[PDB]
From Swiss-Prot, chain A:
Protein name in the entry: ESX-5 secretion system protein EccC5
Cited function: Part of the ESX-5 specialized secretion system, which is responsible for the secretion of EsxN and a number of PE_PGRS and PPE proteins, including PPE41.
Residues spanning the membrane: 38-50
Assembly, per entry: Part of the ESX-5 / type VII secretion system (T7SS), which is composed of cytosolic and membrane components. The ESX-5 membrane complex is composed of EccB5, EccC5, EccD5 and EccE5.
Consequence of gene disruption: Mutants are defective in the secretion of EsxN, PPE41 and PE_PGRS proteins.
Note: Part of the eccB5-eccC5 operon, which is essential for in vitro growth.
Cellular compartment(s): Cell inner membrane
Domain of life: Bacteria
Full-length numbering of the shown residues: 1 to 50 of 1391
């Protein structure tokens, strides 16, 4: 002999929420700009020799 | 040269012999800067970039 059991209306399960996400594009390396280093080096010599 | 000449006209004659090396080296360095030099943004193919 068993105890009777009647199944009621199912309770609400927690709802899942999907998401669409777009990633940030990486930074770009700065191209190699260049100073005329030798020009100022000759310069400081000339003013000194004067 | 006018500066050297001024010292010569005054009669110091200090630039005689090896003393003359000072004007000479100075005059060569000045020559390199004014004739060849280096370009600005209008000249894109600077030696390091090429």
């Amino acid at each position: 002999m068993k105890r009777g059991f009647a199944r009621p209306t199912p309770e609400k399960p927690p709802v899942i929420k999907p998401e669409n996400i777009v990633l940030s594009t990486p930074l770009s390396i700065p191209p190699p700009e260049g100073k005329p280093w030798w020009l100022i080096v000759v310069g400081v010599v000339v003013v000194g020799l004067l | 040269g006018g500066m050297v000449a001024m010292v010569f006209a005054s009669g110091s004659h200090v630039f005689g012999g090896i003393g003359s090396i000072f004007p000479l080296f100075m005059m060569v360095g000045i020559m390199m800067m004014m004739f060849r030099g280096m370009g600005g943004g209008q000249q894109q193919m600077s030696r390091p970039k090429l």
